[PDB]
Amino acid sequence: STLDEIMKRGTLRVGTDADYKPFSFKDKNGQYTGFDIDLAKALAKELGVKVEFVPTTWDGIIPALQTGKFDIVMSGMTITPERKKKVDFSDPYMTAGQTILVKKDNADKIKSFEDLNKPDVKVAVQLGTTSEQAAKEFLPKAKIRTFENNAEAFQEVVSGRADAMVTDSPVAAYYAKLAVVVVDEPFTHEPLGFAIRKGDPELLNWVNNWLKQMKKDGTYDKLYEKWFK
């Protein structure tokens, strides 16, 4: 099993996309930081081993997992049917739903999605994300502005070039640092789990028991309230 390989090697090689705030990213000087990062350190403390983050492209992070470049994937990965065909997921540690970020000035007169389905409304999204899809299917009449990252869209909604922005709930919760304000959309959400290789119940159940215990003692709630307010 990979578990024995880890406890023998003495290090937990964690594969991640070091550019997916606030789950995993770089700091002022090369080091790693994020929710999944602290979680990775916690699991590495559970194993009793050191931590080694292996930065990999989001596109080729699953084949890298399957080729044994690292033992586990922790990068806010969404559990999808297409991915469960390739890799096994652990039990959900985070729930990412669709959330709109707006200015505090517009805290009133805004109920839900349909309140922004006007053609004079300007919303911003990150290109290629599910937030873009949600902004398409639920806000078609409004102008859609796509950007490289969520920070640029956030700048656009803060400055005034955008009435709102559409992003994931953890991201929107993170950017609340407070000036703007958060509105959640009621429909459905997405599960987030860690990813390991096929045919390894030992590591899987270890991860699940460790997560269960971290939710049982309350450490997970501490780490959750730390990052997502």
CA 86 to chain centre: 20
Report residue 170 as tokens: 């953890």
Residue 92 and residue 35 share a domain = yes
Residue 149 and residue 91 share a domain = no
Residue 91 and residue 119 share a domain = no
What does the alpha-carbon distance between residue 2 and residue 70 come to, in Å, rounded to a whole number? 10
Length of the chain: 229
Determined by which method?
X-ray
What does the alpha-carbon distance between residue 17 and residue 58 come to, in Å, rounded to a whole number? 6
Residue 153 and residue 86 share a domain = no
Please compute, for residue 229, the number of CA atoms within 13 A of its CA located in the half-sphere on the CB side.
12
What does the alpha-carbon distance between residue 61 and residue 70 come to, in Å, rounded to a whole number? 9
Neighbouring residues of 103: CB distance < 8 A, sequence distance ≥ 6: 157, 158, 180, 181
* Other beta carbons less than 10 A from residue 172's beta carbon: 27
Residue 136 and residue 92 share a domain = no
Which residue shows structure tokens 């873009």?
132
Residue 206 and residue 173 share a domain = no
Residue 110 and residue 7 share a domain = no
Report residue 223 as tokens: 């780490």
Number of domains the chain is built from: 2
User: Which amino acid, 210?
Assistant: W
Q: Give me the domain span that covers residue 142.
A: 98-185
Q: Resolution for this model in angstroms, one decimal place?
A: 3.4
Residue 30 and residue 13 share a domain = yes
What does the alpha-carbon distance between residue 154 and residue 126 come to, in Å, rounded to a whole number? 10
Left (φ > 0), alpha (ψ -120 to 50) or beta: where does 227 sit? alpha
Neighbouring residues of 215: CB distance < 8 A, sequence distance ≥ 6: 221
Judge whether 90 and 211 are in contact, CB under 8 Å: yes
Judge whether 106 and 123 are in contact, CB under 8 Å: no
What does the alpha-carbon distance between residue 14 and residue 69 come to, in Å, rounded to a whole number? 9
